[PDB]
């Protein structure tokens, strides 16, 4: 998208593998505010927002909390308390043409600064002077959008960069975006400290003799004690016999 009309994808109800992102050699800018990138995979959020656009290289530094400039003031504004990550890479090989790529636009004229996460797509003629414009361009009456015209021979400061801003929103509503939380192999006939889907304990897991229903997960003895569990990956029922102990 053009920065003034930046695109937003709302991401929900999915597992996020962030290893794909931070372990990538292909990004030139990767700054996170309020979250550690490596330590994102053990966090759940209620919504993820992906905002994407193209700007000048000289403008990449404006995609940050508390920044100023034509982009931060009039095109895309992050809040001062931003919890998310800004990712950017040079796309001169893609978003520039030899005659100049005029498809990408930015807002050049605006009376006041954007609120955070505001998106102004208006094309109203901008009144730079005392007498009004009435949709007619001219002196002191300026179309608010301008084009970058990316040419491949531009210096880095004028070459196009693609930017993706990931926002991590956490509301008082059920969380639907968590990180992978991989598992390991299981061993039987040995005292283990185990943590199945939602329960944790210590004991020996053994091949069972019971017939759990297709929807049953955790067993229970008469005295409200966990007795058997359903392994989340293998459809096998494991009896939990607490590890041997006794007085000496």
């Amino acid at each position, epitope marked *: 998208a053009s920065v003034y009309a930046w695109n937003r994808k709302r991401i929900s109800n999915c597992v996020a593998d962030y290893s794909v992102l931070y372990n990538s050699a292909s990004f030139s800018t990767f700054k996170c505010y309020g979250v550690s990138p490596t330590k994102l995979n053990d966090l759940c959020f209620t919504n993820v927002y992906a905002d994407s656009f193209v700007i000048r290289g*000289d403008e990449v530094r404006q995609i940050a909390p508390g920044q*100023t*400039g*034509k982009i931060a*003031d*009039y095109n895309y504004k992050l809040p001062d308390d931003f919890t998310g990550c800004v990712i950017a890479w040079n796309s001169n090989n893609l978003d520039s043409k030899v005659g*100049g790529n005029y498809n990408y636009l930015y807002r*050049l*004229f*605006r*009376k*006041s*600064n954007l609120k955070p996460f505001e998106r102004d797509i208006s094309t109203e003629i*901008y*009144q*730079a*002077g*005392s007498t009004p414009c009435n949709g007619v361009e001219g*002196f*002191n009456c*300026y179309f608010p959008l*301008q084009s970058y*015209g*990316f*040419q491949p*021979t*531009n*210096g880095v*400061g*004028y070459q196009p960069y693609r930017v993706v801003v990931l926002s991590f929103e956490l509301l008082h509503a059920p969380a639907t975006v968590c990180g992978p939380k991989k598992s390991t192999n299981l061993v039987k006939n040995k005292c283990v400290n185990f943590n199945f889907n939602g329960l944790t304990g210590t004991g020996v897991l053994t091949e069972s003799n019971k017939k759990f229903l297709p929807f049953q997960q955790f067993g229970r003895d008469i005295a409200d004690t966990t007795d058997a569990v359903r392994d989340p990956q293998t459809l096998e029922i494991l009896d939990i016999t607490p590890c041997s102990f006794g007085g000496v």
Partner: antibody
Amino acid sequence: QVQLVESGGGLIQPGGSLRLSCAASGVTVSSNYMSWVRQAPGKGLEWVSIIYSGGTTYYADSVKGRFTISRDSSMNTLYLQMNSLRAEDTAVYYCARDLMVYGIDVWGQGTTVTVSS
Amino acid sequence: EIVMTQSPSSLSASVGDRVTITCRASQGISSYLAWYQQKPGKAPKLLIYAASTLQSGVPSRFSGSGSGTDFTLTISSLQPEDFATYYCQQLDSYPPGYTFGQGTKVDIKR
């Protein structure tokens, strides 16, 4: 009548303070990129400061922490407050309306600042 | 940092001559260039913006051309009121500031 009229220049000893005015008609100062540009004798145009319509301000490194740009919407006037003045600040000071890619199209007549002991 | 190299420092021209002034960007600035005129004791006057567009009210004998690194101003038929100094400006640069060419003085040939 589209014009920029500067005033406030004069002779002042180093370390003194000086406040330049730039009165506009036609152009609305608070709706435009407004810059201060100066030119020392026999030297080239040197940008000093700019104020965005949204309120953002920038300053040349050589004047950071000594100059302050501002504006009075009710007076349609641009101001430059110059403190801790030095000899090498001596120049004619212009105010200008910046249109970025459309160039700088409106310039004032200039006011002269001389800093000397 | 991007450097603007303007040449020549001075040229001499009679009235009616075709004048050509050159500006070279140290790296590609596409069309982010403007041309100005300035006379002794006066403020600059904008002539061409966006490398090749003629500012309103400027006589049609002025013309700009070029994109990327090499730019030229052209005065197809020099008039008496065109003896001045001319220089180029990189538009929308970073860090903040106005980078101008060194200037070309156009004096009267004799």
